[PDB]
């Protein structure tokens, strides 16, 4: 679990969005595993606008943060799960690091701000849904 709170927006994994997220829907994209809902309170986070390929992520299944080197956002094949059929997920960045399904939502940050959230993983890999291209999150 986990979310980004920026301005009057809440960014979550689409597969973990709540009834309240869908009732306050701003934008969603199944191919990216992202959903953004509106909030009444002003949010705590800053979005990075950069090309960093290193950063630190939070891993809830270890209660720890880990440094990572990750690939640029790209189209990656993701196996079927209970949430989606087998498909290509876009804007996904992969790195070597521990993750389990419940780690989805953990934030990846660089020195500039929030880069994205955990969205996929397995066998010593962790994948992050990028949010740095969503320029409207800041206006």
Ligand X SMILES: COc1ccc(Cl)cc1OC(=O)N1CCC[C@H](C(N)=O)C1
52 is in an annotated binding site: yes
Q: Among the options 21, 33, 45, 103, which is catalytic?
A: 33
Instruction: Please enumerate in sequence order all residues whose Cβ is within 8 A of that of 1, keeping only pairs 6 or more positions apart, or say none.
Output: 16, 60, 102, 104, 105
Rounded distance between C-alpha atoms, residue 44 and residue 14, angstroms = 20
Task: Give catalytic status of residue 98 as yes or no.
Answer: no
Instruction: Please enumerate in sequence order all residues whose Cβ is within 8 A of that of 103, keeping only pairs 6 or more positions apart, or say none.
Output: 59, 60, 61, 118, 121, 126
Q: Which two tokens stand for residue 19?
A: 């009834």
Task: Give catalytic status of residue 44 as yes or no.
Answer: no
50 lies in the site for Zn ion, by CB under 5 A: yes
Which of Zn ion, ligand X, none does residue 46 bind (CB under 5 to 8 Å by kind)?
none
Q: Which two tokens stand for residue 81?
A: 């799960």
98 is in an annotated binding site: no
Q: Which two tokens stand for residue 67?
A: 């440094």
Q: Tell me how far, at minimum, the Cβ of 62 lies from ligand X, in Å.
A: 12
Sole window of 23-31, 45-53, 69-77, 93-101 interacting with ligand X (rule: CB under 6 A): 93-101
**Residues marked as catalytic:** 15, 33, 104
Return residues touching ligand X (CB under 6 A): 15, 33, 78, 81, 83-84, 89, 99-101, 103-104, 118-122
């Amino acid at each position: 679990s986990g979310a980004i709170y920026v301005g009057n927006y809440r960014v979550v994994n689409r597969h973990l969005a709540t009834h309240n997220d869908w009732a306050n829907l701003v934008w969603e994209d199944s191919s990216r595993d992202l959903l953004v809902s509106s909030t009444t309170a002003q949010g705590c986070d800053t979005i990075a606008r950069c090309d960093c390929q290193t950063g630190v992520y939070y891993c809830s299944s270890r209660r720890k943060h880990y440094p990572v080197s990750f690939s640029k956002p790209s189209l990656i094949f993701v196996e079927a799960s209970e949430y989606y059929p087998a498909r290509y997920q876009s804007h996904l960045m992969l790195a070597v690091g521990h993750s389990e399904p419940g780690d989805c939502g953990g934030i990846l940050r660089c020195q500039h701000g929030v880069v994205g959230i955990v969205s996929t993983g397995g066998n010593g890999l962790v994948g992050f849904a990028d949010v740095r291209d969503l320029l409207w999150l800041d206006e």
